[PDB]
């Protein structure tokens, strides 16, 4: 835990103390059994609950690209990286788009599309979301060396 060379450490460092305190409630979003690991099913349930409707392949992919253990599983730090992923690409991503083409007040609705991490957390947490969403990034990014090959 001292030799920070993983993606979880980054996630933990890209957030803020009070915001992490709010993320504590994230376990309640689905609530497996009061203490357990979450899989594509459980996760897919919560995310489809916001109106979106993807495939298991989508769920696995987003977890796999961050899963260093080679097993998509959500967990203490594994959960954290998930939440940061949406805000990460929204702040500094390449190709990632919320499909928003109107940055105004009379803008389109939820549309059941990939919206901001803020909007989703507001729905997932059930309006408990009040912390300031600050993703520590800038106008700098590059290609990652992360590319896995395995099918389960
Ligand atoms: C629950 C949940 C959750 C948390 N963090 C995410 N970051 C993402 O990109 N997603 C989905 C789209 C909402 C990927 C398909 C995330 N779902
Ligand atoms: Ca895992």
| CATH fold-level assignment | Recoverin, domain 1
Largest sheet: none
What top-tier CATH class fits best? Mainly Alpha
- The CATH superfamily title: EF-hand
The arrangement of helices and strands along the chain is HHHHHHH
- Bound ligand species: 6-ethynyl-1-(pentan-3-yl)-1H-imidazo[4,5-b]pyrazin-2-ol, calcium ion
Count of helix runs: 7
- Total separate domains: 1
Question: What are the defining features of this structure?
Answer:
binds calcium ion, 0% strand, 7 helices, Recoverin, domain 1, 152 residues, mainly alpha, globular, binds 6-ethynyl-1-(pentan-3-yl)-1H-imidazo[4,5-b]pyrazin-2-ol
Any overview of this molecule?
It is a single chain. This protein has 152 residues and is an all-alpha fold. It has one domain (7-95, 105-124): Recoverin, domain 1 (Orthogonal Bundle). The protein has helices spanning 7-13, 17-23, 26-30, 40-48, 56-64, 76-92, 117-124. 6-ethynyl-1-(pentan-3-yl)-1H-imidazo[4,5-b]pyrazin-2-ol (W97) binds next to helix 4, helix 5, helix 6 and helix 7.
